């Protein structure tokens, strides 16, 4: 079959994406504070491990993702998994200035980042990206569009259908902006501002991947089943 994604209109693309959104998971309910280096890293890796399962279900509901061979699907996910978890974290943290909402019951300030060696540097980048999201008034509809772009774009050079789907999402993004009453010039400018943010998400992902591998070497955090495999994906 041809890809049923290309026939979708802007509105159907938007509702298909909002409908695919993964649930928001909770962390451990132990109120023991403050965290140690291991307890902290343990909470985060346990959470991500569980989020990655829902991330995978989410990917399959992204218009045009299942039309790709199993090979490609695997490749795109292994390449962008940390970027996707992070933009999700940045999005959820938008309304909580100076804080990272890893989960409803796990709202961390930058200070708590010091609990883990080398973690505060990453926390600062995530917080700044978060203020950036807040100052631009990022909308949920724009957010799901951005997250889908990371999925399809990050490992796309590592290989026409995918590029046609990206154009679709780009059109969907402008549609959302015209709908918000933005002038032509403001639409193009905003499109640019949003996409430039992906360069930052990528940088954040690279740093966090290295930092996560570090922790692994120290033999601290219990890397879980799926997370470990996703981590190993990066030779």
């Amino acid at each position: 079959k041809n890809s049923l994604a290309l026939s979708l209109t802007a509105d159907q693309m938007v509702s298909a994406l909002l409908d695919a959104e993964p649930p928001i998971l909770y962390s451990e309910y132990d109120p023991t504070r403050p965290f140690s280096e291991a307890s902290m890293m343990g909470l985060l890796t346990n959470l991500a491990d569980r989020e990655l399962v829902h991330m995978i279900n989410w990917a399959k509901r992204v218009p045009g993702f299942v039309d790709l061979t199993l090979h490609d699907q695997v490749h795109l996910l292994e390449c962008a998994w940390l970027e996707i978890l992070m933009i999700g974290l940045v999005w959820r943290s938008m309304e909580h200035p100076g804080k990272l909402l890893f989960a409803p019951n796990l709202l961390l300030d930058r200070n708590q980042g010091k609990c883990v060696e080398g973690m505060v540097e990453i926390f600062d980048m995530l917080l700044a990206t978060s203020s950036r999201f807040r100052m631009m008034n990022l909308q949920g509809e724009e957010f799901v569009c951005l997250k889908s772009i990371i999925l399809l774009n990050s490992g796309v050079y590592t290989f026409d259908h995918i590029h046609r789907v990206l154009d679709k999402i780009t059109d969907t993004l402008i549609h959302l902006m015209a709908k918000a009453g933005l002038t032509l010039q403001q639409q193009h400018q905003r499109l640019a501002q949003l996409l430039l943010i992906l360069s930052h998400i990528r940088h954040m992902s690279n740093k966090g991947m290295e930092h996560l591998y570090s922790m692994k070497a120290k033999n601290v955090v219990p890397l879980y089943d799926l997370l470990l495999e996703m981590l190993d994906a990066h030779r």
Partner: peptide
């Protein structure tokens, strides 16, 4: 090879 990711991508 064997990957949990394969299991989640296929079992759906």
């Amino acid at each position: 090879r064997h990957k949990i990711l394969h299991r989640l991508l296929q079992e759906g």
